[PDB]
Design a protein around this ligand. Structure first.
Ligand SMILES: Nc1ncnc2c1ncn2[C@@H]1O[C@H](COP(=O)(O)OP(=O)(O)O)[C@@H](O)[C@H]1O
Ligand SMILES: [Mg+2]
Length: 243
C-alpha cells in the first residue's frame, strides 16, 4: 500500500522542504523505498537540499509532455531514497502543466513504500495541484497562531478533497519565547501532533550542505527529532522491517 503523502502548510518558510528531505532520508534508513517529489514548480528546491547534482530531465519536462516519467527519476546519495526533481529555469517553469501532477504522481503507485510530495504553500493552482497529488497529508507549522490557523485551513480543504490528514508537525520550536507551546498548538489544531522539531542550527547546516540533518549529524537533536517522526509516520508498512 504505497503511501503518497503531501507535505503542506499555510505559509512559506515553515519547513516543508526540510521535512520532506529529512523524513525521506530517515524512512530510507528504515529500509523503505522512498520517492521524494519536488511539487514546488516555481521554486524547485528539493534536489539542492538532497544534494542531487546530476540532474537534466525533470518533473517539469514530464509535465510538459517532453519526457517519460521513468527518465525523470534519479537515485540519490541516500539509501533507498529516489528523487523526482524540479527544474529551476523559468522556461521549464511555465511549460509545466500543474494540472497533470496528480495523474503523473499517482501512476507511480506500487513502486515505492512512500512517495513524499514537497508542496509549495498556499492554495493557488500550483499548490493545489501538488497537494491533491497525495492521498495523505502532513501539515507543517511554526509556533505562531496565524500560521497554525492558516495551516489548519489548508488541512480542512485537503480533508474535504478526500485526503487523510495524518497530523501536524510543530517546526521551528524554541525560536522565540512567544512560541505557542505544543499543548496549546494541539488544542488549536484538530489533528494529532506528530512531532515537535526545535529550531536547530544543525538542521540549517544540513540544508546548506545538501545533506539532511538526519544523516548529516545523526546524534544531533534535530536529527533525533526527525528520526522519531519517521518512526511514527511509518505505521502503514507494518513489518517495521529491513528484516
Ligand atoms: N527546525 C529548524 N531548525 C533550523 N532551521 C530550520 C528548521 N526548519 C526549517 N529551518 C530552515 O528554514 C528554512 C526553511 O526552508 P524550507 O524548509 O525550505 O521551508 P519551506 O519549504 O516551507 O519554504 C531553511 O533555511 C531551513 O534550514
Ligand atoms: Mg520549500
Amino acid at each position: 500500500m504505497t503511501r503518497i503523502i503531501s507535505i503542506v502548510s499555510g505559509k512559506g518558510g515553515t519547513g516543508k522542504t526540510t521535512v520532506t528531505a529529512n523524513l525521506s532520508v530517515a524512512l530510507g534508513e528504515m529500509g523503505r523505498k522512498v520517492l521524494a517529489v519536488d511539487g514546488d514548480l516555481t521554486m524547485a528546491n528539493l534536489s539542492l537540499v538532497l544534494g542531487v547534482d546530476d540532474v537534466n530531465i525533470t518533473l517539469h519536462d514530464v509535465l510538459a509532455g517532453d519526457a517519460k516519467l521513468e527518465d525523470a527519476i534519479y537515485m540519490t546519495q541516500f539509501e533507498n531514497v529516489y528523487i523526482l526533481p524540479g527544474a529551476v529555469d523559468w522556461e521549464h517553469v511555465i511549460k509545466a502543466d500543474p494540472r497533470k501532477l496528480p495523474e503523473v504522481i499517482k501512476s507511480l503507485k506500487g513502486k515505492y513504500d512512500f512517495i513524499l510530495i514537497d508542496c509549495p504553500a498556499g492554495l493557488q493552482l500550483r499548490a493545489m495541484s501538488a497537494m491533491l497529488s497525495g492521498e495523505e497529508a502532513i501539515l507543517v507549522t511554526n509556533p505562531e497562531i496565524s500560521c497554525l490557523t492558516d495551516t489548519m485551513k489548508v488541512g480542512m480543504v485537503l480533508k474535504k478533497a478526500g485526503l487523510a490528514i495524518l497530523g501536524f508537525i510543530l517546526n521551528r520550536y524554541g525560536r522565540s519565547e512567544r512560541d505557542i507551546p505544543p499543548e496549546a498548538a494541539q488544542d488549536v489544531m484538530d489533528v494529532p501532533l506528530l512531532a515537535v522539531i526545535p529550531e536547530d542550527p544543525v538542521i540549517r547546516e544540513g540544508t546548506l550542505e545538501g545533506i539532511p540533518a538526519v544523516k548529516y549529524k545523526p546524534e544531533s537533536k534535530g536529527a533525533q527529532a526527525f528520526i522519531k517522526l519517521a518512526e511514527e509516520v511509518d505505521k502503514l508498512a507494518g513489518i517495521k522491517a529491513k528484516i
